[PDB]
Short mmCIF file of C-alpha atoms in Angstrom, two decimals:
data_model
loop_
_atom_site.label_atom_id
_atom_site.label_comp_id
_atom_site.label_asym_id
_atom_site.label_seq_id
_atom_site.Cartn_x
_atom_site.Cartn_y
_atom_site.Cartn_z
CA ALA A 1 204.28 73.90 111.73
CA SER A 2 207.94 73.24 112.45
CA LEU A 3 210.47 75.57 114.06
CA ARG A 4 212.52 76.02 110.88
CA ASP A 5 209.45 76.84 108.78
CA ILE A 6 208.23 79.38 111.34
CA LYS A 7 211.69 80.95 111.52
CA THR A 8 211.89 81.28 107.74
CA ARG A 9 208.41 82.84 107.65
CA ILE A 10 209.44 85.33 110.35
CA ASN A 11 212.59 86.30 108.45
CA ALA A 12 210.72 86.79 105.16
CA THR A 13 208.01 88.85 106.85
CA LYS A 14 210.64 91.03 108.54
CA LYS A 15 212.36 91.73 105.22
CA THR A 16 209.00 92.63 103.65
CA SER A 17 208.20 94.91 106.59
CA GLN A 18 211.49 96.78 106.22
CA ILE A 19 210.98 97.23 102.47
CA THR A 20 207.46 98.59 102.97
CA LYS A 21 208.60 100.96 105.72
CA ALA A 22 211.30 102.39 103.44
CA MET A 23 208.77 102.84 100.63
CA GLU A 24 206.37 104.65 102.97
CA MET A 25 209.10 106.98 104.21
CA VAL A 26 210.02 107.87 100.62
CA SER A 27 206.39 108.42 99.61
CA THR A 28 205.78 110.83 102.49
CA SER A 29 208.51 113.19 101.25
CA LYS A 30 207.33 112.84 97.65
CA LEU A 31 203.80 113.83 98.69
CA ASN A 32 205.15 116.79 100.66
CA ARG A 33 207.00 118.03 97.57
CA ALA A 34 203.98 117.49 95.30
CA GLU A 35 201.90 119.67 97.62
CA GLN A 36 204.41 122.51 97.21
CA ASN A 37 204.35 122.11 93.42
CA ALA A 38 200.54 122.28 93.42
CA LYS A 39 200.74 125.40 95.60
CA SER A 40 203.21 127.00 93.17
CA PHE A 41 200.85 126.39 90.24
CA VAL A 42 198.06 128.51 91.77
CA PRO A 43 198.69 132.14 90.62
CA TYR A 44 199.01 131.29 86.91
CA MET A 45 195.74 129.36 87.09
CA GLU A 46 194.08 132.30 88.84
CA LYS A 47 195.23 134.92 86.33
CA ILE A 48 194.40 132.80 83.28
CA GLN A 49 190.98 131.93 84.72
CA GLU A 50 190.22 135.61 85.27
CA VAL A 51 191.42 136.72 81.83
CA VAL A 52 189.50 133.92 80.09
CA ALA A 53 186.31 134.59 82.06
CA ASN A 54 186.63 138.21 80.93
CA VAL A 55 187.60 137.86 77.27
CA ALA A 56 185.69 134.73 76.18
CA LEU A 57 182.33 136.49 76.71
CA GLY A 58 183.42 139.48 74.61
CA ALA A 59 180.41 139.42 72.26
CA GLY A 60 181.84 136.70 70.06
CA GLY A 61 182.06 133.00 69.34
CA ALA A 62 184.56 130.25 68.62
CA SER A 63 184.64 126.47 68.35
CA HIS A 64 185.64 125.93 71.98
CA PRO A 65 183.07 128.10 73.87
CA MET A 66 179.96 127.10 71.89
CA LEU A 67 177.48 124.82 73.64
CA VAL A 68 177.72 122.22 70.85
CA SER A 69 180.67 121.69 68.51
CA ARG A 70 180.44 119.97 65.12
CA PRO A 71 177.28 117.81 65.38
CA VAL A 72 177.44 115.16 68.10
CA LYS A 73 180.10 112.56 67.33
CA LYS A 74 183.00 110.63 68.92
CA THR A 75 183.49 111.69 72.55
CA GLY A 76 187.01 112.13 73.91
CA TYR A 77 188.06 110.54 77.19
CA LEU A 78 191.29 111.49 78.96
CA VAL A 79 192.27 109.32 81.94
CA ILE A 80 195.24 109.76 84.28
CA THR A 81 196.68 106.68 85.99
CA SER A 82 199.93 105.82 87.72
CA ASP A 83 202.73 104.01 85.92
CA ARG A 84 203.33 101.52 88.76
CA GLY A 85 201.20 99.57 91.20
CA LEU A 86 201.30 99.32 95.01
CA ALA A 87 199.03 102.38 95.24
CA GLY A 88 195.89 100.70 96.56
CA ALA A 89 192.68 101.29 94.63
CA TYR A 90 194.14 104.44 93.02
CA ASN A 91 193.97 103.16 89.44
CA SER A 92 190.97 100.84 89.83
CA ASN A 93 188.71 103.56 91.24
CA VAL A 94 189.14 105.73 88.13
CA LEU A 95 189.12 102.81 85.70
CA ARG A 96 185.83 101.39 86.99
CA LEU A 97 184.09 104.76 86.58
CA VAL A 98 185.53 105.25 83.08
CA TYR A 99 184.52 101.74 82.02
CA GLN A 100 181.00 102.16 83.41
CA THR A 101 180.45 105.49 81.66
CA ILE A 102 181.80 104.25 78.31
CA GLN A 103 179.77 101.04 78.37
CA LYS A 104 176.58 102.75 79.53
CA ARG A 105 176.27 105.98 77.53
CA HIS A 106 177.76 104.97 74.17
CA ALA A 107 177.18 101.21 73.76
CA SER A 108 179.26 101.23 70.56
CA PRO A 109 183.05 101.30 69.91
CA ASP A 110 182.65 104.04 67.31
CA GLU A 111 181.55 107.20 69.14
CA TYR A 112 184.35 107.35 71.72
CA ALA A 113 188.13 107.40 71.96
CA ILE A 114 190.50 107.19 74.90
CA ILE A 115 193.70 109.03 75.81
CA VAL A 116 195.63 107.47 78.69
CA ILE A 117 198.43 108.72 80.94
CA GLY A 118 200.36 106.02 82.76
CA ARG A 119 201.11 102.39 82.04
CA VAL A 120 198.40 100.89 84.26
CA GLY A 121 195.45 102.43 82.43
CA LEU A 122 197.03 101.64 79.07
CA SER A 123 197.36 97.97 80.05
CA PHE A 124 193.82 97.94 81.44
CA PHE A 125 192.34 99.25 78.19
CA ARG A 126 194.54 97.08 75.95
CA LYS A 127 193.50 93.97 77.88
CA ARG A 128 190.00 94.85 76.67
CA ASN A 129 189.35 95.99 73.07
CA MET A 130 188.87 99.76 73.47
CA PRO A 131 190.77 102.08 71.08
CA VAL A 132 193.53 104.34 72.44
CA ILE A 133 194.71 107.27 70.32
CA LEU A 134 197.52 108.86 72.34
CA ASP A 135 199.48 107.93 75.45
CA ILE A 136 202.49 108.90 77.56
CA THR A 137 203.98 106.45 80.05
CA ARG A 138 207.11 107.50 81.98
CA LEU A 139 207.08 110.87 83.72
CA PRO A 140 209.01 112.58 86.51
CA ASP A 141 207.54 112.39 89.99
CA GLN A 142 207.50 116.21 89.89
CA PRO A 143 206.73 117.21 86.29
CA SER A 144 207.68 120.63 84.97
CA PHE A 145 205.76 122.87 82.59
CA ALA A 146 207.21 121.33 79.42
CA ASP A 147 206.79 117.65 80.35
CA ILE A 148 203.40 116.95 78.74
CA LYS A 149 203.26 119.98 76.46
CA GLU A 150 203.16 117.88 73.28
CA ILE A 151 200.41 115.54 74.51
CA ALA A 152 198.28 118.44 75.75
CA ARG A 153 198.72 120.34 72.48
CA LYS A 154 197.79 117.23 70.48
CA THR A 155 194.73 116.65 72.66
CA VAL A 156 193.59 120.22 71.99
CA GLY A 157 194.32 119.80 68.28
CA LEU A 158 192.19 116.67 68.07
CA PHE A 159 189.25 118.85 69.12
CA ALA A 160 190.48 121.66 66.87
CA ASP A 161 190.34 119.61 63.65
CA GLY A 162 186.82 118.36 64.38
CA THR A 163 187.91 114.80 65.15
CA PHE A 164 186.30 115.02 68.61
CA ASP A 165 182.95 116.36 69.76
CA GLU A 166 183.80 116.82 73.44
CA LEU A 167 186.43 115.92 76.03
CA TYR A 168 185.92 114.39 79.47
CA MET A 169 188.79 113.91 81.91
CA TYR A 170 188.95 111.52 84.86
CA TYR A 171 191.47 111.56 87.70
CA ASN A 172 191.89 111.28 91.46
CA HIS A 173 191.47 114.55 93.34
CA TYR A 174 193.49 114.96 96.53
CA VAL A 175 191.37 115.68 99.61
CA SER A 176 193.33 114.07 102.45
CA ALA A 177 196.07 111.52 103.06
CA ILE A 178 193.42 108.82 103.51
CA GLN A 179 190.68 110.10 101.15
CA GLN A 180 191.03 110.71 97.41
CA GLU A 181 187.97 111.29 95.23
CA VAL A 182 187.51 110.23 91.62
CA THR A 183 186.48 113.27 89.60
CA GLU A 184 184.91 113.70 86.17
CA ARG A 185 185.41 117.12 84.58
CA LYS A 186 183.92 118.50 81.37
CA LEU A 187 187.02 119.81 79.59
CA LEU A 188 185.95 120.72 76.04
CA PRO A 189 183.74 122.39 75.13
CA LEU A 190 184.42 124.43 78.27
CA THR A 191 180.79 125.61 78.43
CA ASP A 192 181.23 127.49 81.73
CA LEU A 193 183.11 130.54 82.98
CA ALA A 194 183.78 132.45 86.18
CA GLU A 195 181.34 135.20 87.18
CA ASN A 196 183.77 138.14 87.28
CA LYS A 197 183.99 141.76 86.09
CA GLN A 198 184.02 140.99 82.38
CA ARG A 199 185.34 144.33 81.07
CA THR A 200 188.60 144.47 83.08
CA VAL A 201 191.09 143.46 80.38
CA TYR A 202 192.69 146.59 78.87
CA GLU A 203 194.62 144.36 76.46
CA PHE A 204 196.07 146.30 73.52
CA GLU A 205 193.88 144.46 71.04
CA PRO A 206 195.37 143.14 67.79
CA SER A 207 191.92 141.66 67.23
CA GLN A 208 189.40 141.00 69.99
CA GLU A 209 188.20 137.70 68.50
CA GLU A 210 191.58 136.65 67.08
CA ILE A 211 193.12 136.69 70.56
CA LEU A 212 190.72 133.89 71.55
CA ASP A 213 192.29 131.55 68.97
CA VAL A 214 195.52 131.83 70.99
CA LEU A 215 194.05 132.13 74.49
CA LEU A 216 191.66 129.15 74.45
CA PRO A 217 194.30 126.52 73.54
CA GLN A 218 196.46 127.93 76.35
CA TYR A 219 193.53 128.00 78.78
CA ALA A 220 193.09 124.33 77.91
CA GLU A 221 196.21 123.59 80.00
CA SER A 222 193.81 123.13 82.88
CA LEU A 223 193.90 119.54 81.58
CA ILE A 224 197.69 119.33 81.81
CA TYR A 225 198.04 120.73 85.32
CA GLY A 226 194.86 121.29 87.33
CA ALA A 227 194.21 117.56 87.06
CA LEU A 228 197.73 116.12 86.88
CA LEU A 229 199.09 117.83 89.99
CA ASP A 230 196.17 116.49 92.02
CA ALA A 231 196.71 113.09 90.40
CA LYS A 232 200.36 112.98 91.47
CA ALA A 233 199.54 114.15 94.99
CA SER A 234 196.82 111.50 95.28
CA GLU A 235 199.18 108.83 93.94
CA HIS A 236 201.86 109.64 96.51
CA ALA A 237 199.35 109.82 99.37
CA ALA A 238 197.83 106.49 98.30
CA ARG A 239 201.27 104.88 98.17
CA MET A 240 202.07 106.21 101.64
CA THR A 241 198.82 104.92 103.15
CA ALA A 242 199.05 101.52 101.44
CA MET A 243 202.65 101.05 102.55
CA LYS A 244 201.93 101.94 106.18
CA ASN A 245 198.96 99.55 106.20
CA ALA A 246 201.19 96.81 104.77
CA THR A 247 203.84 97.50 107.41
CA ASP A 248 201.27 97.27 110.21
CA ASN A 249 199.95 93.98 108.84
CA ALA A 250 203.50 92.61 108.63
CA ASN A 251 204.21 93.62 112.23
CA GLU A 252 201.04 91.91 113.47
CA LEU A 253 201.93 88.75 111.54
CA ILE A 254 205.44 88.83 113.01
CA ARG A 255 204.01 89.05 116.52
CA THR A 256 201.68 86.08 116.01
CA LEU A 257 204.39 83.99 114.34
CA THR A 258 206.77 84.73 117.22
CA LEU A 259 204.16 83.51 119.70
CA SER A 260 203.73 80.30 117.69
CA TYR A 261 207.51 79.86 117.49
CA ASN A 262 207.90 80.16 121.26
CA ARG A 263 205.13 77.62 121.87
CA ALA A 264 206.75 75.17 119.44
CA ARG A 265 210.16 75.66 121.07
CA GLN A 266 208.79 74.92 124.54
CA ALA A 267 206.97 71.83 123.26
CA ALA A 268 210.12 70.54 121.55
CA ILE A 269 212.23 70.98 124.69
CA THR A 270 209.63 69.20 126.82
CA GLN A 271 209.32 66.28 124.41
CA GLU A 272 213.08 65.84 124.10
CA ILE A 273 213.70 65.83 127.84
CA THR A 274 210.77 63.47 128.46
CA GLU A 275 212.08 60.99 125.89
CA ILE A 276 215.61 61.17 127.33
CA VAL A 277 214.36 60.57 130.88
CA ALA A 278 212.10 57.69 129.80
CA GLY A 279 215.00 56.02 128.02
CA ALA A 280 217.26 56.58 131.03
CA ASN A 281 214.82 55.07 133.53
CA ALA A 282 213.87 52.17 131.24
CA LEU A 283 217.20 50.51 132.14
CA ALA B 364 180.79 58.10 98.36
CA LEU B 365 181.97 61.17 96.39
CA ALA B 366 182.26 59.25 93.13
CA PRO B 367 180.60 60.06 89.78
CA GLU B 368 178.90 56.66 89.57
CA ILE B 369 177.37 57.07 93.05
CA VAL B 370 176.31 60.72 93.28
CA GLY B 371 175.96 61.63 89.61
CA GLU B 372 178.06 63.46 87.05
CA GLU B 373 176.78 66.98 87.69
CA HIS B 374 176.93 66.52 91.47
CA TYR B 375 180.53 65.33 91.22
CA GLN B 376 181.53 68.17 88.90
CA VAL B 377 179.88 70.83 91.08
CA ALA B 378 181.63 69.46 94.17
CA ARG B 379 185.01 69.41 92.42
CA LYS B 380 184.57 72.95 91.09
CA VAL B 381 183.62 74.24 94.55
CA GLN B 382 186.65 72.54 96.09
CA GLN B 383 188.93 73.99 93.39
CA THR B 384 187.65 77.51 94.04
CA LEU B 385 188.08 77.12 97.80
CA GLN B 386 191.63 75.78 97.34
CA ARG B 387 192.56 78.78 95.20
CA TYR B 388 191.09 81.13 97.80
CA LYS B 389 193.10 79.41 100.53
CA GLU B 390 196.26 79.81 98.46
CA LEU B 391 195.62 83.55 98.08
CA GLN B 392 195.29 84.04 101.85
CA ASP B 393 198.84 85.13 102.71
CA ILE B 394 199.05 87.75 99.94
CA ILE B 395 195.60 89.04 100.89
CA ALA B 396 196.64 89.27 104.54
CA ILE B 397 199.92 91.08 103.85
CA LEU B 398 198.77 93.64 101.31
CA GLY B 399 195.07 93.21 100.54
CA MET B 400 193.25 92.60 97.29
CA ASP B 401 194.55 95.72 95.50
CA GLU B 402 197.45 93.85 93.86
CA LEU B 403 195.45 90.81 92.76
CA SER B 404 194.73 90.17 89.10
CA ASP B 405 191.25 90.31 87.59
CA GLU B 406 190.76 86.53 87.70
CA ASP B 407 192.04 86.27 91.28
CA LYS B 408 189.56 88.93 92.40
CA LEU B 409 186.75 87.00 90.72
CA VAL B 410 187.94 83.83 92.48
CA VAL B 411 187.80 85.62 95.84
CA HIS B 412 184.38 87.06 94.98
CA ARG B 413 182.97 83.60 94.24
CA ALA B 414 184.79 81.86 97.09
CA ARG B 415 183.57 84.13 99.89
CA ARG B 416 179.96 83.68 98.79
CA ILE B 417 180.42 79.90 98.48
CA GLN B 418 181.93 79.72 101.97
CA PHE B 419 179.06 81.76 103.41
CA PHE B 420 176.46 79.67 101.58
CA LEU B 421 177.98 76.54 103.13
CA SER B 422 176.50 77.77 106.44
CA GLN B 423 173.06 76.65 107.58
CA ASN B 424 170.55 77.28 110.36
CA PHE B 425 169.93 74.14 112.41
CA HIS B 426 166.71 73.04 114.07
CA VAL B 427 168.58 72.53 117.36
CA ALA B 428 169.92 76.09 117.13
CA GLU B 429 166.43 77.43 117.91
CA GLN B 430 167.48 77.54 121.57
CA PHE B 431 170.53 79.75 120.96
CA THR B 432 168.96 82.06 118.35
CA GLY B 433 165.30 82.50 117.49
CA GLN B 434 165.77 81.65 113.81
CA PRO B 435 164.01 78.37 112.91
CA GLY B 436 165.97 75.63 111.21
CA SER B 437 165.81 74.42 107.63
CA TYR B 438 166.04 71.11 105.76
CA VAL B 439 167.70 71.30 102.34
CA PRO B 440 167.44 68.52 99.73
CA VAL B 441 170.61 67.52 97.90
CA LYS B 442 169.07 68.53 94.56
CA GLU B 443 168.45 72.04 95.88
CA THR B 444 171.98 72.17 97.31
CA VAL B 445 173.55 71.16 93.98
CA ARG B 446 171.37 73.57 92.00
CA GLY B 447 172.17 76.47 94.32
CA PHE B 448 175.91 75.88 94.24
CA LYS B 449 175.79 75.50 90.45
CA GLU B 450 173.94 78.81 90.17
CA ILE B 451 176.48 80.52 92.43
CA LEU B 452 179.35 79.13 90.34
CA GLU B 453 177.69 80.35 87.13
CA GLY B 454 177.73 83.91 88.48
CA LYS B 455 173.99 84.53 88.81
CA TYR B 456 174.28 86.11 92.28
CA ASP B 457 177.53 88.10 92.06
CA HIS B 458 175.63 91.34 92.72
CA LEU B 459 174.12 90.29 96.05
CA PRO B 460 176.01 91.23 99.24
CA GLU B 461 177.95 88.39 100.81
CA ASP B 462 176.14 88.80 104.14
CA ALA B 463 172.90 87.62 102.51
CA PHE B 464 174.30 84.08 102.15
CA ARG B 465 174.76 83.51 105.89
CA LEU B 466 172.71 80.88 107.74
CA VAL B 467 169.95 80.11 105.23
CA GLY B 468 168.48 77.11 103.45
CA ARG B 469 167.62 77.19 99.76
CA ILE B 470 168.97 79.82 97.37
CA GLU B 471 165.44 81.24 97.37
CA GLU B 472 166.10 82.28 100.97
CA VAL B 473 169.27 84.08 99.86
CA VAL B 474 167.15 85.88 97.26
CA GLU B 475 164.50 86.75 99.88
CA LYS B 476 167.26 88.18 102.03
CA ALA B 477 168.84 91.38 100.69
CA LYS B 478 165.23 92.45 100.14
CA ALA B 479 164.52 93.08 103.81
CA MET B 480 167.66 95.18 103.38
CA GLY B 481 169.03 97.05 100.39
CA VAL B 482 168.95 95.11 97.14
CA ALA C 364 199.16 100.72 142.86
CA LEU C 365 198.29 103.21 140.09
CA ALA C 366 194.57 103.12 140.87
CA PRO C 367 192.46 105.92 142.38
CA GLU C 368 191.29 103.65 145.22
CA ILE C 369 194.62 103.90 147.07
CA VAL C 370 196.74 106.62 145.43
CA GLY C 371 194.17 109.41 145.06
CA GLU C 372 192.00 110.77 142.28
CA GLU C 373 194.24 113.78 141.59
CA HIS C 374 197.35 111.60 141.47
CA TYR C 375 195.64 109.15 139.11
CA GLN C 376 194.45 111.92 136.78
CA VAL C 377 197.87 113.59 136.70
CA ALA C 378 199.61 110.28 135.94
CA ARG C 379 197.13 109.42 133.18
CA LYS C 380 197.49 112.84 131.56
CA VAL C 381 201.30 112.68 131.72
CA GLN C 382 201.31 109.23 130.10
CA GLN C 383 198.90 110.39 127.38
CA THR C 384 201.07 113.42 126.59
CA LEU C 385 204.21 111.28 126.44
CA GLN C 386 202.53 108.77 124.12
CA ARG C 387 201.31 111.59 121.87
CA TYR C 388 204.85 112.97 121.66
CA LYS C 389 206.22 109.50 120.91
CA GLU C 390 203.80 109.05 118.01
CA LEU C 391 205.14 112.15 116.21
CA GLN C 392 208.83 111.19 116.10
CA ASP C 393 208.89 109.79 112.57
CA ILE C 394 206.94 112.66 111.00
CA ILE C 395 209.12 115.19 112.84
CA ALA C 396 212.26 113.45 111.58
CA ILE C 397 211.01 113.29 107.98
CA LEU C 398 209.28 116.63 107.41
CA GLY C 399 210.67 118.75 110.25
CA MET C 400 209.36 120.68 113.23
CA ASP C 401 207.81 123.56 111.27
CA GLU C 402 205.49 121.24 109.30
CA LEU C 403 203.36 120.30 112.32
CA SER C 404 200.03 121.76 113.37
CA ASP C 405 199.63 124.18 116.27
CA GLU C 406 198.30 121.55 118.67
CA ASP C 407 201.16 119.22 117.72
CA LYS C 408 203.56 122.11 118.37
CA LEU C 409 202.09 122.61 121.84
CA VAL C 410 202.16 118.87 122.58
CA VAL C 411 205.84 118.62 121.63
CA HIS C 412 206.61 121.79 123.59
CA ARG C 413 205.03 120.47 126.79
CA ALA C 414 206.28 116.89 126.39
CA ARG C 415 209.89 118.00 126.08
CA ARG C 416 209.38 119.81 129.39
CA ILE C 417 207.84 116.74 131.04
CA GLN C 418 210.60 114.41 129.84
CA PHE C 419 213.22 116.68 131.40
CA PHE C 420 211.27 117.17 134.63
CA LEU C 421 211.10 113.39 135.07
CA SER C 422 214.84 113.51 135.82
CA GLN C 423 216.31 114.10 139.27
CA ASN C 424 219.63 114.89 140.94
CA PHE C 425 220.67 112.01 143.19
CA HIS C 426 222.56 112.19 146.48
CA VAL C 427 224.98 109.46 145.38
CA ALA C 428 225.86 111.43 142.23
CA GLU C 429 227.21 114.36 144.27
CA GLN C 430 230.68 112.80 144.40
CA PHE C 431 230.82 113.17 140.60
CA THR C 432 228.72 116.29 139.95
CA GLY C 433 229.10 118.59 142.96
CA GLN C 434 225.37 119.24 143.07
CA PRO C 435 223.65 118.04 146.26
CA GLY C 436 220.88 115.49 145.98
CA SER C 437 217.17 116.02 146.53
CA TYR C 438 214.23 114.19 148.11
CA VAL C 439 210.92 115.07 146.46
CA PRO C 440 207.65 114.23 148.25
CA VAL C 441 204.81 112.71 146.26
CA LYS C 442 202.60 115.75 146.86
CA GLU C 443 205.33 118.05 145.56
CA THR C 444 205.96 116.03 142.39
CA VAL C 445 202.23 115.69 141.70
CA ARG C 446 201.69 119.43 142.09
CA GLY C 447 204.70 120.23 139.90
CA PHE C 448 203.55 117.94 137.11
CA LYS C 449 200.03 119.38 137.36
CA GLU C 450 201.44 122.90 137.03
CA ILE C 451 203.51 121.87 134.01
CA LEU C 452 200.47 120.25 132.37
CA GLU C 453 198.44 123.42 132.97
CA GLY C 454 200.98 125.43 130.96
CA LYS C 455 202.12 127.53 133.93
CA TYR C 456 205.76 127.29 132.80
CA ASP C 457 205.65 127.18 128.98
CA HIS C 458 207.80 130.32 128.66
CA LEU C 459 210.68 128.82 130.63
CA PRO C 460 213.71 127.36 128.81
CA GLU C 461 213.62 123.58 128.59
CA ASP C 462 217.12 123.04 129.99
CA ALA C 463 215.96 124.57 133.28
CA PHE C 464 213.97 121.38 133.97
CA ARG C 465 216.95 119.09 133.46
CA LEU C 466 218.31 117.97 136.86
CA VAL C 467 216.27 119.83 139.50
CA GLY C 468 214.08 118.72 142.38
CA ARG C 469 210.88 120.54 143.30
CA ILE C 470 209.03 122.95 141.02
CA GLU C 471 210.77 126.00 142.50
CA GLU C 472 214.29 124.78 141.74
CA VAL C 473 213.52 124.95 138.01
CA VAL C 474 212.46 128.59 138.42
CA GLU C 475 215.66 129.37 140.34
CA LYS C 476 217.80 127.61 137.72
CA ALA C 477 216.09 129.46 134.87
CA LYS C 478 216.55 132.79 136.65
CA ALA C 479 220.23 131.95 137.14
CA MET C 480 220.59 131.25 133.41
CA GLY C 481 218.76 134.48 132.59
#
């Protein structure tokens, strides 16, 4: 190529490298904060898990704990995706699994419905012809308890009014900065409990089975947090890793382009001086 | 000689389609280098998927290469070449690994490979 | 000349270990700046702790700088500097303050300076 073209390429690559480095440095702090939020969530999850594992087996039944709800019908799918790209395979990894499961174990656009979080998954499903019932798009990078309260309550209500048979949720679980695992979790009917000391409740009972009608919808907030906090942590870690990889690639390209530029410069100088000397001695 | 009245209509069309796919793949190279395939669209990813396999299938094992590597050479008729590239373009072998297309003759040899290894 | 054939196996090993420690410390600068010192692991803490000692011990008080400082210069033999760096790598002086290693000569002058500080 020519010197001017190589110089322009170098300048563009340097600008891209700086932008990616800034994005990586932001994403590192965002991931660090998301880890603290996930840590803060722990004790409430622990206490509610214990109290549910105790009470829900209290010699009774309800729509949520039974092995089968209203006879097998439309299955509910809840998927959590980011609202913006540049996160690597973060969205695609979950979307491929969801697509495979839907196409393989239903084979009909009648016995399933999809609830999406994030713009990317919504666009992915709307590019195809799969029905979406509910969705939320723009969220804080560090959501608080009331951010997705309405969507979670509506998702529970869709099972409550018999519209859904069961709920499956898909998301990215945070394991390490470089490894995030796609996870499928059976949400409703919950169908499993913790093996704890079942009698330790001592709740002043208004009604031992009526309390379940309030507890189970609130225990359902495993969907809102136990998955979403991991999803946000995985999203930030994926952004950080993708941005550092992009920065490294840009630096390598800059090095190679600089070598090419220096070779071209030397060749140009040699050719110019040779032509000048030939013209001078041709006289 | 690459003219429809000399090589045939389907031969000409297959050649032009292969060249178009390779040109698109070459255009995608800088984006792929900078930030990988994660930000490509669905059609661009399919173009890359087809183009890598086409580029690998363009390789061949020569008779005179017996001295460098023990693999015997192969002679491929133009009809077999056209049929194989047409089949690759139609998407018949999108599930095979791209390493199975290296240094073979007919598409039957690509099919026989990836059986000595995982299918 | 940094090859065991002419400089000595112990000298080569000490130099390689010092360079590795310095490179390891250099790699952590961005994460230390972003998250902070307390966010590192224990081994990273030890690496930073020892590397900040090595960086300071690489300095020296020159004879020609006496006219400006008042501190006399020093001439450090290669055996002395090799042994001092080996001792620092072994962790013999991890409890000493880091500023004691700033502008001293042999490995005993740092001890004397630290004792003078308290």
